[PDB]
Design a protein around this nucleic acid. Structure first.
Lengths: 135, 131
RNA sequence: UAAGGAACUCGGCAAAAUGACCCCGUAACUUCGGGAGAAGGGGUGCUCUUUAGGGUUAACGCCCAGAAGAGCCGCAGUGAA
RNA sequence: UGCAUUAGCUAGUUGGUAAGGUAACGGCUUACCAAGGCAACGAUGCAUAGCCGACCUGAGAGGGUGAUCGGCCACACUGGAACUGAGACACGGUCCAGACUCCUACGGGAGGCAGCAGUAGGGAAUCUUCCGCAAUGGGCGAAAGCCUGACGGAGCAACGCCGCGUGAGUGAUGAAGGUCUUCGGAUCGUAAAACUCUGUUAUUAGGGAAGAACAUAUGUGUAAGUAACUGUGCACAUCUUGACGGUACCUAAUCAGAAAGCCACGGCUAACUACGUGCCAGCAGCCGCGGUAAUACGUAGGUGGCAAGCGUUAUCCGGAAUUAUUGGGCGUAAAGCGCGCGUAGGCGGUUUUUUAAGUCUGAUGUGAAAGCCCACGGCUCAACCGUGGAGGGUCAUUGGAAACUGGAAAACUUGAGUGCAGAAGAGGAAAGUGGAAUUCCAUGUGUAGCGGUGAAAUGCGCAGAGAUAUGGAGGAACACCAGUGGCGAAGGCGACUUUCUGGUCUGUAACUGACGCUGAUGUGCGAAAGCGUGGGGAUCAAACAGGAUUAGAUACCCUGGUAGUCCACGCCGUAAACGAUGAGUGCUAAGUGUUAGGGGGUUUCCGCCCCUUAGUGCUGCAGCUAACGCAUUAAGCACUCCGCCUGG
RNA sequence: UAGGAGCUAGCCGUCGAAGGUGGGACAAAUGAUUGGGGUGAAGUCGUAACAAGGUAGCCGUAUCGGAAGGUGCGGCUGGAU
C-alpha cells in the first residue's frame, strides 16, 4: 500500500474465531443475559445419552450425550471410557476437546468428576477415567 | 511528474550497470552534481564529469569496474521519497554491509557522508545504502 | 336513581355516552388520491391593565380581540337548545 | 474502543448585550440582537469499557492483562433535597419519595454487610461466625487511657515460587522370579535376599532467640529562658511491655526409619513385546490402528521424559512477515466497477536567493515506585527485599546551521493548453438516390403435383397453388470498396450524397509560464433481454401448433406462427462489458510488416530504397513469475495517486 | 397589643424526582405450524457436467420445466473443423 493511505486506513488485524463456543459463555440468571468467563469445565446435566457412527471409514459406535450446561445450551458431548453411570439425568461435568471423524460433537465428558464415577477396568490409563491410584 | 529525482537518477545507473556500461550521465542541480561528486570523492567510478547544457546539463559517470569483467556498485537505493522523508541519528548510525558500504548524510552542514558525519556528530537525511 | 356495569338478550335491541369552535398531535395499510374529524390531548365565564392586532383604524376609542399579563366568582363558563 | 448496514447536528443552542456569584469565569439562568455555531477530519447518536503507572511476551518496530501492587476518579437499597462542618450534598448523619425485610401486647416501632469474618444463593472455584494491638500508623487528650475487623500475626489451600526429601560399599552375568523361545538364554538383575553404614526430614525430650527499640514513666540542667520554677525542644540513666511463641533454633537419643506419580512405547518422538481382539471393544495432535498373525485397541514386564507431580480442559503470546511501516498481492490462484468524466482529498516538471519553522546537532533540568542498565548488600542456598551511580540516550527550559521540505519573492519549456499546414473514416443527431430480395394482390401461363423432409409426411394444389417478364405494390436493411483497416473513454461505430460537428494524428513548433495525475462525492453512457406506446408480425422467432423418425415426441428434422422482433417513444443499470492487466511519468537486445503526417535519394511513367513521428501488428534478450507466458502496444527496472484483497 | 417591617403560619404561581397511564419506538424470549440450509445414510431414480462425455462452452438476460435442463437475444474463448 501507501504509507499515506495507511494513515487514512490502518492495518486492522484479523480476528480468530475460537473453538468450543459453549465453554466461554455464562448466563446472567437474574437478567436472562450471557456472561463470558471461559471456564475449563462448566457442569451440566444429561438429557439424552446415545452413540454415533463415525462417517469417516473407521467403524465403531462412540458414545455421546445431549447435555445442557449451566448456561442452558444443549450440546452433543462425547463420553469417553467404556462403562459409565450415564443412563439419564446425571449431573455431570463437561470439558472441551473435539473428537474427530464425528460431525457436530466436539465436547468431552469429564469422567469421574461430578456425578459419574469413572470406568473401572483400566490399568494403563488409570489417572483418567476416575480410577484412583492402586494401593 | 516524477517525484524522486535522486532515485530515478540512481536507478538509471543500475539500469545500465546490469548490461555492463562504462559511460552514462545525468542532469544537474545545485545538489545532484555535488551528490555525484561524493560518489567520485570516494571514487567508485572513473570520474564523474562536467555539466554542459542549458538547463541541467549532463554530467558523466564513467563506470569503473574490476578486472574480472565485474561491477563495483552492488546495491543502489535511495531510502527517502516524497511521502516519506527519513532521518538518522549520529549516535546509533549503522554501517552499510557491516563496514562494506557507504551512507550519506544531508543537512545544512553540507551534504556529508558516513565518515563525514560519524566524526561530525550530526545526523541528517540519509539517502543511499550503496555497497 | 344507591352499589354494581352487558351479569340482559337470539343479538348491547332500546337508552346512555360523543358532538360546536380553537390549538396541539395523529398508526397500519395503500391503487399515492387516501385512510383522517384516525386514534389521542388541551382550552373556552367576567373585570382591569396593553404593548397591539382584525383594525372600526382616523387609533388606542367603534365591536371582536393581537393575544399577553394581573385579578374576581361559581359545584359546573360553547353553564340553555 | 468501534459502527455512515449512524450524515446533516445544535436553537439558551450559536456569539455578544445587562443582573446575579462563584475562592473566580461566563449561555450558568434571566430580558435583547443575527441565524448563527457544529459538522464526512464522521459533529450527532448507538454499542462497549473506570483511567494511568504496572504486568506480560515480543529482535526492535511493540502492543494484549489489572487477581495483582501503587496513584488518581466514581459509589455506598434506589432516587431526590438540604443541613452541619474548614472540608459532604456525609459508607455504621437528617428529611422526602419509592421498593424490600424485620419486631409487636396491633399502639406503632425498626433496617440497609461493596468496613471483617460468617450465612444463603449462583458458580468449576477461590480463606477461620480465628488471635492480639506487642510493633507501626491514625484519632481526641500534656501524658496516661480507648478505638483499631487498619495493622502485626495464626488457620486453610502444591493454586503457584525456592530448597528438602522417596537415603549407601558390597556380594551370583541364574537364590526362589516371565511382556519370549526355531527355550540354550541373557535375564526385571551387581535388583535383591545377607550385610558395612549414615540419621535431611522424620521419632521426642531438654536449654530457647532475636525482633523485644523507641518513647512517657525514671532529677541535674541547657535553649526562648522565667519575677522564680514545672512546661516545652535538647544530654543521661535509671525501666515499660511482646499476638506471633517457648513456635522458630540448638543439643542429644532414634531406625537406613514412615514418602513420589503419570502418558505413550506406530512416523513425527528417545521409551516393545506376548494374551485377547476381529473395523467390535475402543484409541485418535496430522497421517491413521483393529476385517483371527494390532508393535496403535484392551490386557501385563522393561524403559522414557521428570519429579510431588502427571495428564486433561479452556484462556493470551512466540513460533508466523495468514495484516506483511519495518516485512503482502491485485493477467490465469483472492484481490480493476463495464468504462469513464469528474467533487473533495492525496501526490505532483525544471533551475537560483530569505527562515532555521520540519530536519540534525549542542548547555542543562530531564522522564515514574515493585516493573526497567550495571555492580554489591540482605536473605542457609534461594524464593523473596535495599543499596550506588547509571538517567535518560525520548520531554521541557535553551543556542544555532539551509542543501532538502513549509511560507516569501522569479524564470525555462519539453508536460499540458491557446497557434499555424494538412490526412483519414463505420464518431453521434438530420435530408436525398437507387439496386436486390421473403410476403401479397393481378395479368400471361397452365394442371399435376408445389413446398418440406437425415426418412417420409403435415401443409400448400385444380379457385390455377408457385411459375414467368416490360412491367404493380409492401416490410426492412443495403454483399462489392471490407482489412492483426481507421475512428470512439466504453457500451460501440458499415450502401452511400449532403447538413452540423466531435475527436484522432503528424509537421513547424509561435506563444502562457507547469497551468498535471489520481480521481472518494456527483454525473453520464451503458450491450442484450424484460416493464409499455406508434409504425411490427415481410422474413426471423420464444410460448403454441403440425408431421413422422427414433426402441422412445411435440426432442436432433421441418415449417406455420405469438409477442418480442426492425425503428422511433420511456427506461431498467446489469455481461467472459476481459487486453481475465487502474491511471500519469523515467530507463533496458532486436527484426518485421502496416495507418496518417512531415523528410528525402534516385526517379517512376506514381514506382524503387531510406530517415522520422504517432501508432496498428508479428516474431523474438536481460529481467520476471509457480510456470504459462510478458519483453516498447512488459506481467522488466523505478516514482505518484486511487481502489481491492487476505481459507471454503 | 404584638398592629405595621420581617419571621412561624397562611395562601398564590415557576421548576421538579418518582409515579400514573398514554401512544408508540427499540430489544430479547416464546409460539400450534411452517421453509430455506447443513450433516449422515446417500434408501431411491436419472445421468446432466468431465472424453467434440453421444445434441462445445461461459456471462448478462428472459422464459418454460418439480429439478436437471429447454429456448432466445447481445457479448467472451476459458473450444473442435
Amino acid at each position: 500500500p501507501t504509507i499515506n493511505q495507511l494513515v487514512r486506513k490502518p492495518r486492522q488485524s484479523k480476528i480468530k474465531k475460537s473453538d468450543s463456543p459453549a465453554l466461554n459463555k455464562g448466563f446472567n440468571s437474574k437478567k436472562k443475559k450471557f456472561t463470558d468467563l471461559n471456564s475449563p469445565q462448566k457442569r451440566g446435566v444429561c438429557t439424552r445419552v446415545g452413540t454415533m457412527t463415525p462417517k469417516k471409514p473407521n467403524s465403531a459406535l462412540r458414545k455421546y450425550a445431549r447435555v445442557r450446561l449451566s448456561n442452558n445450551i444443549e450440546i452433543n458431548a462425547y463420553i469417553p471410557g467404556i462403562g459409565h453411570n450415564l443412563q439419564e439425568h446425571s449431573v455431570v461435568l463437561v470439558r472441551g476437546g473435539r473428537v474427530k471423524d464425528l460431525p457436530g460433537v466436539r465436547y468431552h465428558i469429564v469422567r469421574g468428576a461430578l456425578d459419574t464415577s469413572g470406568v473401572d477396568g483400566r490399568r494403563q490409563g488409570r489417572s483418567l477415567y476416575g480410577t484412583k491410584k492402586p494401593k | 511528474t516524477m517525484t524522486d529525482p535522486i532515485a530515478d537518477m540512481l536507478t538509471r545507473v543500475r539500469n545500465a550497470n546490469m548490461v555492463r556500461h562504462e559511460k552514462l550521465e545525468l542532469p544537474a542541480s545545485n545538489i545532484k552534481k555535488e551528490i555525484a561528486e561524493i560518489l567520485k570523492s570516494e571514487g567508485f567510478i572513473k570520474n564523474v564529469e562536467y555539466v554542459e547544457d542549458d538547463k541541467q546539463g549532463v554530467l558523466r559517470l564513467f563506470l569503473k569496474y574490476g578486472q574480472n569483467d565485474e561491477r563495483v556498485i552492488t546495491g543502489l537505493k535511495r531510502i527517502s521519497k516524497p511521502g516519506l522523508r527519513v532521518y538518522a541519528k549520529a549516535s546509533e548510525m549503522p554501517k552499510v554491509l557491516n563496514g562494506l558500504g557507504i551512507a550519506l548524510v544531508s543537512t545544512s552542514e553540507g551534504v556529508i557522508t558516513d565518515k563525514e558525519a560519524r566524526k561530525r556528530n550530526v545526523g541528517g537525511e540519509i539517502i543511499a545504502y550503496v555497497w
